[PDB]
């Protein structure tokens, strides 16, 4: 018990243990408030038209760890009372929020929120989108059902409230419950590999690919992954451009060289210029009967597939079936937020319901022995489907000392999110902190900075992928990788998770180098490691 617990409300009514029933004009919910280890759990079921359903109300803390819904968005500590709404880029509206009306008035946090000594968190997002808002000094938890009606009962997304001095332990515990609730996939083996993006970007040639393929026999890579560059257009994934061969021919060549073939797609996205859009314009999410722009990128309007339509799911099954048959066993599936944009779909289901039919179709198509890696993705809804997940914005071959914490490529902000989302590793999935850039030339990263990034990711036990012209990686670059791989295998903890000054103390236990600690400063770019 406590004064602060007595101040809480659940579904409109002062907090206490028990079973309850709430009959309102347009919906009904039945819920239980049960005791669990380190606090409380609210669970139940709902029917009718719940709209934006208020679950919990409590006093807003002064400092809160907030979390954006998707890969690239910040997880960071923020002063709650001195919040001002950001201006929202109309090209990137839905990477900031799936409920942008909230963000333009109030501080928002998706899926969970933390303070010193306390965590509030939902265990799932299967039907509704669970978020928090700070409204006039109160913290308020909602489930958004996006105007769907339910004739029969469906389960609530469960909420837990946990209390203990050790906040790191609360987050690790929250994540364990999330893991159990969603049948998380956590492979016993972690892949190493190579990725084209962070050297060649959109200008990768097959000539350059063949060159790197040969050099990679001298590096400890299992996987060889082609990124954005090969494809004809966004949506036309089985047609290549430039000097590239067929998609089947690439897979066959990578395999012969002794590597697991990997390939990038953005599978819920189709451009205004693509073949598949012009063939099948009715396959996309709509506004007033017209195609609704999901985002703008590659200097084109990009639309979202309507994953409520059988035609669309059949098309996805056939695509990823074909890729599997060719020999691809590693799939980076990107810009997935597109699949969950609000709007008009064929069937009257939520965007989250549609997202989940989408990603389940992909897993079905590629099978169980394929490794899926999420990117640009809603986090909670993906748990149990993906094997790995990018948990930060894009890294870069420069620190970004003078770049703002929005979502623009920068090493500093990419590593920040790997630290503040550490607790998802080995519970939701394998965390992907984005690629190591270890080349000596064609870069602005200092040796110090390269050491900071790589050793931190090794301590955290995160996926280790390099992205370089392997010609430009010599003695220092090879040594940094070898040592980073030595740092894997432990159980990590960020001890000062609520810090506001970009300095962190991080421990890991049972690494291949025993027990270690690293102290890192992301502002000054300094580190201190003990083995
Ligand atoms: O377009 C390819 C691509 C896109 C994504 O990165 C960005 C996504 C953006 F919206 C803007 C940007 F400058 C970079 C992925 O995180 C990155 O890893 C790469 O695969
Ligand atoms: Mg009250
Ligand atoms: Mg591990």
Residue numbers in the entry: -6 to 524
Authors' account:
Of the GH mechanisms that catalyze glycosidic bond hydrolysis, most that occur with retention of stereochemistry rely on two active site aspartic acid (Asp) and/or glutamic acid (Glu) residues. These enzymes employ sequential SN2-like reactions, each involving an inversion of configuration, where the first generates a covalent glycosyl-enzyme intermediate and the second one hydrolyzes the intermediate. As a result, we hypothesized that a galacto-configured analog would covalently label a GH36 α-galactosidase, a member of GH clan-D, that has as its main structural element a (β/α)8 fold, which is the same protein fold as found for family GH13. Here we present the synthesis of three cyclohexene-based mimics of galactose including a 2-deoxy-2-fluorogalactose analog and the kinetic characterization of their reactions with an α-galactosidase from Thermotoga maritima (TmGalA).
With the aim of delineating the conformational itinerary for intermediates along the reaction path, we undertook structural studies to observe enzyme-bound species during the covalent inhibition of TmGalA by carbasugar 3a. In order to obtain a complex with intact 3a, we employed a D387A mutant of TmGalA in which the acid/base aspartic acid is mutated to alanine; this mutant displays an approximate 3100-fold reduction in its second-order rate constant (kcat/Km) relative to wild-type45 for the hydrolysis of 4-nitrophenyl α-d-galactopyranoside. We note that the active site contains electron density consistent with a Michaelis complex of an intact molecule of 3a bound. The carbasugar moiety displays a 2H3 half chair conformation with key interactions between the C6-OH with Asp221; the C4-OH with Trp257, Asp220, and Lys325; and the C3-OH with Lys325, Arg383, and Tyr191. The C2-OH and the 3,5-difluorophenyl leaving group of 3a form no interactions with TmGalA, and 3a itself has no interactions with bound water molecules. Unfortunately, after performing a variety of crystal soaking experiments with inhibitor 3a, only structures of the Michaelis complex (with an active site mutant) and product complex were obtained and no covalent adduct was observed (vide infra).
